[PDB]
Enzyme design. Structure first.
Site, short mmCIF file in Angstrom:
data_model
loop_
_atom_site.label_atom_id
_atom_site.label_comp_id
_atom_site.label_asym_id
_atom_site.label_seq_id
_atom_site.Cartn_x
_atom_site.Cartn_y
_atom_site.Cartn_z
N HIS A 1 -0.53 -11.43 -4.43
CA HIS A 1 0.84 -10.94 -4.33
C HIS A 1 1.83 -11.94 -4.91
CE1 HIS A 1 -0.94 -7.83 -1.95
NE2 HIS A 1 -1.34 -8.70 -1.04
N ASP B 1 -3.36 -2.71 -4.87
CA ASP B 1 -2.36 -3.73 -4.55
C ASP B 1 -1.46 -4.01 -5.75
OD1 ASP B 1 -3.11 -4.18 -1.87
OD2 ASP B 1 -4.25 -5.99 -2.36
N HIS C 1 0.83 -1.21 0.00
CA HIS C 1 0.00 0.00 0.00
C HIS C 1 0.86 1.25 0.00
CE1 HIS C 1 -3.26 -2.62 2.13
NE2 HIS C 1 -3.03 -2.99 0.88
N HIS D 1 -9.39 -1.92 -4.67
CA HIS D 1 -8.27 -2.17 -3.78
C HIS D 1 -7.30 -3.18 -4.38
CE1 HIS D 1 -5.91 -2.18 -0.16
NE2 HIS D 1 -5.79 -3.49 -0.35
C1 C90 Z 1 -7.29 -7.78 0.18
C2 C90 Z 1 -6.12 -8.77 0.31
O1 C90 Z 1 -5.44 -8.87 -0.91
C3 C90 Z 1 -5.16 -8.31 1.41
N1 C90 Z 1 -5.86 -8.12 2.67
C4 C90 Z 1 -5.93 -9.21 3.61
O2 C90 Z 1 -5.40 -10.25 3.40
C5 C90 Z 1 -6.66 -8.95 4.93
C6 C90 Z 1 -7.08 -7.66 5.16
C7 C90 Z 1 -7.74 -7.34 6.33
C8 C90 Z 1 -7.96 -8.32 7.27
C9 C90 Z 1 -8.65 -8.15 8.62
C10 C90 Z 1 -9.19 -7.93 9.65
C11 C90 Z 1 -9.88 -7.65 10.97
C12 C90 Z 1 -10.79 -6.60 11.06
C13 C90 Z 1 -11.43 -6.34 12.25
C14 C90 Z 1 -11.17 -7.12 13.37
C15 C90 Z 1 -11.85 -6.87 14.72
N2 C90 Z 1 -13.30 -6.68 14.61
C16 C90 Z 1 -13.88 -6.60 15.91
C17 C90 Z 1 -15.37 -6.24 15.84
O3 C90 Z 1 -16.10 -7.04 14.90
C18 C90 Z 1 -15.45 -7.21 13.64
C19 C90 Z 1 -13.98 -7.63 13.79
C20 C90 Z 1 -10.25 -8.16 13.28
C21 C90 Z 1 -9.61 -8.43 12.08
C22 C90 Z 1 -7.52 -9.63 7.06
C23 C90 Z 1 -6.87 -9.95 5.87
C24 C90 Z 1 -4.42 -7.03 1.03
O4 C90 Z 1 -4.93 -5.95 1.01
N3 C90 Z 1 -3.03 -7.11 0.67
O5 C90 Z 1 -2.40 -5.89 0.34
CL CL Z 2 -1.37 -15.31 -6.13
ZN ZN Z 3 -3.94 -4.49 -0.05
#
Ligand code: C90
Ligand code: CL
Ligand code: ZN
Ligand code: CA
Length: 300
Positions: free
Chosen positions: A265, A242, A79, A238
């Site tokens: 990735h 990425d 990012h 998004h």
């Molecule tokens: C898009 C992909 O490609 C990649 N993203 C990921 O893999 C990825 C992103 C985000 C997350 C997460 C999370 C998360 C959110 C909130 C809470 C706590 N909360 C408490 C209250 O109720 C709801 C939950 C705990 C955990 C997990 C994984 C990327 O962007 N790569 O650049």
């Molecule tokens: Cl991949």
């Molecule tokens: Zn991302």
């Protein structure tokens, strides 16, 4: 005037937490000399470990893009690098007090704003571009990532989530940056994850810093974030963000087109490695006159 390399005009500081480690981290962006590239520096270590943000230093691609050198890593660079690429920054030192870049609000928006508040500085050397001359394609399973020649910079992505929140929605998008603003249409698109996975991820020391303040949380039948989405197609936008960040591990802005189908990735990095190896498919170019170039940049 020629298109010049750019660095930061002033030092930038930010504090945050790593999305996956949950660790508090201090981020410092500093100007750097011509032909430095973007270099990450673990300043919690002594001596520091410096890792150029280049495809050859990608060591892990599970969940996020990770740079490795010796025993040391810098996690989740995509990012921040997307913001650097989007603003045309060639040279910068990126100091971190911990192993993971802060997630901020889950998008590139806060980085873009911090950088544009500091301002950019043109340098007395030609900016170098990697121009795609031949198609280069990698596939694995149902995933595909392709470079094709294109007079400009264009990124397209397609997702295919078997999920009630994604079925029937816009899961393909194409952004041509000659007619579309990175800042307004891509940079604010936030990362996302699925509620069903959070306990499992945490059990693996992943998503430990996640919150609705830095990620879209998709539940079984709804988005959890009460304040809503920034774009109707924020998810695929998004993925484009990425891709722009992962592609900047080439170390130079691209003249060409990227098309991704469920490409994460890992496959992004494999595309970069295949392109670099196929030297018939690319060349390094500079522009003595910005007026005649296929890409243009905002004032610094
Ligand atoms: C898009 C992909 O490609 C990649 N993203 C990921 O893999 C990825 C992103 C985000 C997350 C997460 C999370 C998360 C959110 C909130 C809470 C706590 N909360 C408490 C209250 O109720 C709801 C939950 C705990 C955990 C997990 C994984 C990327 O962007 N790569 O650049
Ligand atoms: Cl991949
Ligand atoms: Zn991302
Ligand atoms: Ca990982």
């Amino acid at each position: 005037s020629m298109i010049k390399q750019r660095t930061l005009k002033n030092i930038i500081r930010a504090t945050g937490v790593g999305l996956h480690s949950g660790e508090k981290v201090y981020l410092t962006l500093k100007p750097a000399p011509v032909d430095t590239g973007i270099v990450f520096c673990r300043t919690d270590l002594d001596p520091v470990v410096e890792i150029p943000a280049r495809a050859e230093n990608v060591g892990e691609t599970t969940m996020s893009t990770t740079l490795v050198k010796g025993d040391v890593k810098v996690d989740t660079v995509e990012h921040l690098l997307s913001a650097m690429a989007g603003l045309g920054i060639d040279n910068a030192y990126v100091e971190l007090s911990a192993s993971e870049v802060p997630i901020m609000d889950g998008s590139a928006g806060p980085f873009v704003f911090l950088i544009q508040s500091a301002g950019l500085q043109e340098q007395e050397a030609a900016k170098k571009f990697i121009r795609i001359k031949r198609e280069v394609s990698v596939e694995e399973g149902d995933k595909r990532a392709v470079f094709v020649p294109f007079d400009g910079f264009k990124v397209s992505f397609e997702i295919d989530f078997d999920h009630p929140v994604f079925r029937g929605r816009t899961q393909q998008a194409s952004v041509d940056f000659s007619s579309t603003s990175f800042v307004k249409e891509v940079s604010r698109a936030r990362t996302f994850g699925f509620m069903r996975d959070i306990e499992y991820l945490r059990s693996q020391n992943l998503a430990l810093g996640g919150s609705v303040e830095n990620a879209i949380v998709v539940d079984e039948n709804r988005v959890l974030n009460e304040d809503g989405l920034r774009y109707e197609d924020e998810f695929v936008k998004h993925k484009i963000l990425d891709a722009i960040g992962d592609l900047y591990l080439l170390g130079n802005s691209l003249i060409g087109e990227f098309r991704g189908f469920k490409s994460g990735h890992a496959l992004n990095n494999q595309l970069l490695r295949t392109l670099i190896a196929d030297k018939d498919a690319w060349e390094v170019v500079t522009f003595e006159d910005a007026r005649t170039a296929p890409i243009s940049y905002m004032r610094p």
